[PDB]
């Protein structure tokens, strides 16, 4: 498993560019999950069973 | 598994632009979930039973 | 395992711009989660069962 | 050259606002201007010799 | 040369606001300009020779 | 050259205000200028020989 020469660009993120302006926002929670803004998850691997990986606004409720 | 001389891009995320001007939001939530926003999820591996990779907004209820 | 002459780039994040301007937000929470704000989670590996890697906003009640 | 979700105004003008509540007025001339009102002049290029652009309130003689 | 996200104003007014409550007003005029009221210019080029470019209330005479 | 997310205001103009409750005001005038009210003048290239501009309340004579 090798790399001679090259470039190797794996789970990555860039340039994620955002704006705003004037924006007004109201929220309200009660027990759940709110997610309002930027959010970059890069990984590689995950390994392992029943896992959750980058998870984002998970409500898990469970008996 | 070898490369020799390239540009190898897996799993990458770029030029995510986003913009927003004069937005007015308002948002309420009793026990779920809610996403409003910019998410970038780049992985290049999940392994594993029974998983959950890269949720958004996921509500598990289970019994 | 080896790499000759090369550039590696395996689970990384940048350039994450963001500009925000005469934003107003009200928020109220009771019990759950509220994530508003810039996250950036860059990992190589996550190992083991009944794992959470890069959660986010991750309301988690179980019985 | 490239723009992405750029913005670019050359010589605009926009987001003016003017309230009044029980304003009142009165006026009398005689042979000479007056601007009472909102006014709003957007001009990207004038040229000339003696040129006149965005004139307002005027008066001119001889 | 490339913009991303950007946002590029040459020669721009925005965002004025005027609120006005309960205001009284008189005028009188004889022959020459009064200039009451909100005004916004806005010009990116300009040329000429004995030019008069975004004049309010001028009066020229001779 | 490259803009992200910048932004690039030359010669502008921008988050003016004016508040004014139960204000009263009264104006007389003979063959002059009178400027009471809110002005925005914004230019990015003004040429000439002799030239007259963003000129406000402006009296010329010979």
Avoid: R
Avoid at 25 to 31: A, C, F, K, L, R
Avoid at 33 to 51: I, R
Wanted: net charge positive; hydrophobic share 40%; glycine share 12%.
């Amino acid at each position: 498993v090798l790399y001679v020469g090259s470039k190797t660009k794996e789970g990555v993120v860039h340039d994620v560019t955002t704006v705003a302006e004037k924006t007004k926002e109201q929220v309200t929670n009660v027990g759940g999950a709110v997610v309002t803004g930027v959010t970059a998850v890069a990984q590689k691997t995950v390994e392992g069973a029943g896992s959750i990986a980058a998870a984002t606004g998970f409500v898990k409720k469970d008996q």
